[PDB]
Every structure is written in C-alpha cells, then in structure tokens.
Amino acid sequence: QFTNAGPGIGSVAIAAKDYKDNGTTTGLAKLAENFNGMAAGFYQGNWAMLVTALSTNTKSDILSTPSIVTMDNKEASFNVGQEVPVQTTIERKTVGTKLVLTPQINEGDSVLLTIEQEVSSVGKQATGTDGLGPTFDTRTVKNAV
C-alpha cells in the first residue's frame, strides 16, 4: 500500500464491505470526493492488483493593457479592480488592475515613467485563508524607466 495515489485500498475495501446488505455510503463517498484518474483492479486467482494513474496538465494566459493619458509631472491614478476590507477594526484596499503613473517628458521624445503597478486579487470572494484577513495574489512592478 502507498499514498502518492488518490486513495488507499484500506478505505475502499472497508467501504465495499460496509456498503453490503444496503449499508452506508458516507464513508466511501468521502474518499472518492476528490479522486482523479484511472483506478483499474484485476483478480488473477488470488493476487489482487490496483493500478492508479492521472496526469493533470494545465494552461493559463493573461494579458492586461491599462493605458491612461496624463499631463506631464502630474501623477495619474488608474484602477480597475476593487476595495476589500483588511484587518489591522478593518481597512479598505484597492486591489485590481492598477496603474499609478507620473510621466515626465524629455524635451524631445523619450518619457521618464515612474510606474507603481500590480495585478492583484483576493483569490476567491467565497474562499478563506490559513491566516486571519483576506489574501492577495499580486504582480507588481514599481520602477522609473
């Protein structure tokens, strides 16, 4: 018996013996809740065999292009996101697509851009944390370029 596998032959066998004579299904239905793959049993005479396999393979692509038109040497703000409370008694934090930019112009062509930006999120509006307040997935970059 191993563990890297979805379920243990223990819970399965016990459940099958507990499901006999119109038994319960809670126990076994709780094992098979998150299982994902191909569990293939085989009986050749007396040796039982259980084969487990799943490959999870994933893909995501994100692309945000928040533009804004500002006067030189005034800081613009630009937000498209949201105010969620955080503990500290609570507090409001604007987490979404933010661009805060104060451009500064070289006489001729080239812009000095002071950027503070991030793409941040409160994970799931219906999901908790191992901590105490909300958490945020952020992608930030504050630099002058």
Binding site: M71, D72, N73, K74, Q104, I105
Partner: peptide, 27 residues
C-alpha cells in the same frame, strides 16, 4: 521638485519648482 533641494544647498539666491510644468524658477 527634487532638483530644488539639490540647488538649495548651492544657494545656501531663491528657488522654487513648479510641480506642473516641472520647471525650476531661480532668481
């Protein structure tokens, strides 16, 4: 705004920086 502080040393002549046009007015 940043240059004003720098130049204030050199003066320390009367300076201010306009945040808008980002220009330095010295006398």
């Amino acid at each position: 705004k940043d240059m004003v502080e720098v130049l204030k040393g050199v003066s320390s002549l009367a300076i201010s920086a306009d945040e808008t046009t980002n220009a330095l007015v010295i006398t």
